[PDB]
Design a binder for this molecule. Sequence first.
Ligand SMILES: O=C(O)CC[C@@H](NC(=O)c1cccc(NCc2ccc(/C=C3\SC(=S)NC3=O)cc2)c1)C(=O)O
Length: 435
Amino acid sequence: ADYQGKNVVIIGLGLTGLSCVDFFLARGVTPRVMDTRMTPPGLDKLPEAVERHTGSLNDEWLMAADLIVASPGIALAHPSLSAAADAGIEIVGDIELFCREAQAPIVAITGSNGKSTVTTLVGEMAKAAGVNVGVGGNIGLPALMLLDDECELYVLELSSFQLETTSSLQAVAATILNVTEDHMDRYPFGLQQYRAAKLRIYENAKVCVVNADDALTMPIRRCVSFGVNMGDYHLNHQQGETWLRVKGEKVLNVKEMKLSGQHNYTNALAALALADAAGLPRASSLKALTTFTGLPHRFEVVLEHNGVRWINDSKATNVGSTEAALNGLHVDGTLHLLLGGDGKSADFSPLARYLNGDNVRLYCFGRDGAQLAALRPEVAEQTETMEQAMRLLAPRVQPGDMVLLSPACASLDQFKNFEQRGNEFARLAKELGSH
Ligand SMILES: O=C(O)CC[C@@H](NC(=O)c1cccc(NCc2ccc(/C=C3\SC(=S)NC3=O)cc2)c1)C(=O)O
C-alpha cells in the first residue's frame, strides 16, 4: 500500500496509537491524531510536529481525511465515524496496516477466553523450532512494532474489535477458541453481532481451526477441529491419566505439562493444531508444551503460605473466564471469591451454579458490585474498591482456604487495565497473607 500524499487521521493514542504515528512518519507521511480523552496515555510522547486534537473528535479533520486509522477502543458505530464511512472515507486499524506490510505468514488467534495463552504457546513452539517469531497484537505489544524483514512467522492475538477494522488478513492458520458473552456494551445487536466480528478471522485463512465443543466458533457456511471428546485434536482419559491425541494417536501425556486443568489441555490442543498448520515440527511443539509456565494474571498463584493459596486471575474479565476458574475447582476450606468492576452488561447468572453450599464467600466491588452480590446475597459483602474487599476478607481467612480474584468484569472503571488490578491484588495478598 502507498500512503504518500494522503491525509491520515489516527483516532486513539496510547502505545498502539503511537505505533501508528511512528509507522506513518517512517514512511514520510505526517498524520494527525485525535482522542476523546483530554490527556490520553502517551500524549507526552507524541512528537510536536504531529498536530493533535484531544477531549473530543474533530469532524472537520475526519471529513477531510483520505484514511482514518481507528483504535479498537473507539466504536465504528460512533456517529462521527459512521458519517465518515457514509462519505466513503476509508477506515482501517493497526492490524490492517500490519497485514498489508507483513512478509511472513501469520497465525491469527481470537476467542472470549484463552487467546493470550494460545498465542503465547504457539510463539514458544516457534522459538523451540529455532524460528524467528514475532508475537503480539494485545495491549502491551502492538503489532506494528513487530514488523521485521527477518521475522519468519508472526503469531497475533486479535480481539473482535481489531477484526472489525481488518480486511487484508490471510492467516496461514486462524482460530476462534470459543464465543461466550462479552463486550455487550459494544455490540448492541447482541451475541451474534459479537460472533460475526470474530468470524472475520477465517476469511481467506489457509487453515481454519475450530472448537468441536463450541458451535459458535464454526463458520456459518473442512476446518480442523479440537475438542474434549471429539475433534481431530482431542483428549484421551484412561486410568487417572490424560493424553493429548491427534486423530487417535497419542502425542503427549499431560503430566509432562506445567499447566493443569481441562481448559489448559484444550488450549494446548488448539496451539498444536495451529503450529502444525503453520508447518512447525511436531516434536519441538510438544517440547514447548512441557516448558510453558503460564501467563501472569491467569490463575496465577501469587502466595501460598500458612495453609492459604492466594490466586490472581485478574485476566478473568468476563463470565466465561470466571466459570472456567470455578468449574471443577477444589478448595479444602472456604473459597473467598473477589468479583467486580465493569461487567459490560453481562448476564452474571451462569456463575450462580458454582456458588452454593457452606464453603463460599463473595466480596463484590466496583461499578457492578451490587449486581454481583445479588448472585447470592446471604454469603456476599459489597465494598467500593478491591482493596477494601481484601482488607475485609483477610481476617476471615483460615488454613485450608483459597482467596481468588476472578472478577468476571473489566477493570477499566477503577484501574488502567487488568494487569494493574492483578499487581495490586498481589501486593495486598503479600501484605495480608503473612504475619
Ligand atoms: O483490562 C481490562 O480490564 C479490560 C480487558 C478487555 N479490554 C478491552 O475491552 C479493550 C478494548 C479495546 C481497547 C483496549 N485497550 C486500549 C485502549 C483503551 C482505551 C481506549 C479509549 C479511548 S480511544 C478514544 S478516541 N477515546 C477513548 O476513551 C482506547 C484503547 C481494551 C479485554 O481485553 O477483553
